[PDB]
């Protein structure tokens, strides 16, 4: 699915979304 960030930190060098879900893109890293 996606995955929730941990203490404001995500693994796999991914980025935390505004919804608390990890992922990629400018909407996640921006």
UniProtKB/Swiss-Prot annotation:
* Disulfide cysteine pairs (residue numbers): 5-16, 10-22, 15-29
What stretches pass through the bilayer? none
Q: Where is the Chitin-binding type-1 domain?
A: 2-30
Q: What is this protein called?
A: Antimicrobial peptide 2.2a
Q: Which residues of the full protein are shown?
A: 68 to 97 of 163
């Amino acid at each position: 699915a996606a995955g929730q960030c941990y203490r404001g930190r995500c693994s796999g060098g991914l980025c935390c979304s505004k919804y608390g879900y990890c992922g990629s893109g400018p909407a996640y890293c921006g």
